[PDB]
Design a protein around this ligand. Structure first.
Ligand SMILES: *C(=O)c1cccc(OC)c1OP(=O)(O)O
Length: 106
């Protein structure tokens, strides 16, 4: 159950995800997963970042889910569940702006 997950914010808008993530107290990698605004069946991983060029900012990554079963951001790297995907990206930055660190505070 992905809805049981504390990092799953469900049906919130992209603007709302940015409002929650653009809090000065959020370190790099603060994140949440929400439904995509327009892609049916896809989730969206919203992640905070920070650098001297952009300062505090937010990145969004589409998470696909196949009827065939797998969840992924890139088709080359798939998982059996959204939870496993989140766990993998909490250890590997790979192509993301930062590895996932802590769940976005309400
Ligand atoms: C996720 O689906 C996603 C990925 C990349 C960019 C955006 O919006 C900027 C995004 O959020 P969405 O709700 O528009 O799909």
């Amino acid at each position: 159950s992905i809805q049981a997950e504390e990092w799953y914010f469900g049906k919130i808008t992209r603007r709302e995800s940015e409002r929650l993530l653009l809090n000065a107290e959020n370190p790099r990698g603060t994140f949440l997963v929400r439904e995509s605004e327009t892609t049916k069946g896809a989730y969206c991983l919203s992640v905070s970042d920070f650098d001297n060029a952009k300062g505090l900012n937010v990145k969004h990554y589409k998470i696909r889910k196949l009827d065939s079963g797998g969840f992924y951001i890139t088709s080359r790297t798939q998982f059996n569940s959204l939870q496993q995907l989140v766990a993998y990206y909490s250890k590997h930055a790979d192509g993301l702006c930062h590895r996932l660190t802590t769940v976005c505070p309400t």
